[PDB]
Amino acid sequence: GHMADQLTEEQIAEFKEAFSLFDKDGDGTITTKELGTVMRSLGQNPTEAELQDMINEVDADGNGTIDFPEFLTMMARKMKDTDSEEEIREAFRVFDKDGSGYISAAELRHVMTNLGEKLTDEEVDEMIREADIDGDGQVNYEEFVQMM
Ligand SMILES: [Ca+2]
Ligand SMILES: [Ca+2]
Ligand SMILES: [Ca+2]
Ligand SMILES: [Ca+2]
Numbered sequence: 001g002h003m004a005d006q007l008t009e010e011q012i013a014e015f016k017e018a019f020s021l022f023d024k025d026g027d028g029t030i031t032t033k034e035l036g037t038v039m040r041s042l043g044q045n046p047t048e049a050e051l052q053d054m055i056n057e058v059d060a061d062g063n064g065t066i067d068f069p070e071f072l073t074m075m076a077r078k079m080k081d082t083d084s085e086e087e088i089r090e091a092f093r094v095f096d097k098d099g100s101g102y103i104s105a106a107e108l109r110h111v112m113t114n115l116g117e118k119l120t121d122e123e124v125d126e127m128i129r130e131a132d133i134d135g136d137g138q139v140n141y142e143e144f145v146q147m148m
Pocket of ligand 1: 023024025026027028029030031034
């Protein structure tokens with residue numbers, strides 16, 4: 001069988017109830033009105049245009065609303081995304097061996113060396129310099145997030 005079918009109908013019904021947090025009239029799609037409702041419940045207040053722009057960047061079939069599949073797709077990407085931030089933070093820590101919040105040439109020297117590379121001091125210092133944005137001689141976490 002398939003793991004997806006390893007639930008009960010009452011359980012799928014219950015899973016579907018959770019969608020109603022956003023899909024308040026229960027019809028199976030989120031409208032701009034419903035999403036505006038949710039936003040305003042969080043203290044925000046966007047326009048019809050802004051609400052239609054949020055919806056559009058998740059609206060896979062083009063019909064102007066968010067069904068439960070699109071929502072779950074959107075959520076899964078979000079969940080994988082926050083994990084990718086956890087691990088860029090993890091990676092910053094590995095480079096920043098002294099936990100000072102800033103990566104030195106020395107610290108980048110070290111990691112590069114332990115990763116195989118055989119670059120010069122200049123080439124490594126050419127990295128810190130190319131990566132710096134506040135000219136402080138070190139690489140804070142944000143200049144590090146610029147590792148695209
Ligand atoms: Ca609805
Ligand atoms: Ca849709
Ligand atoms: Ca450091
Ligand atoms: Ca810096």
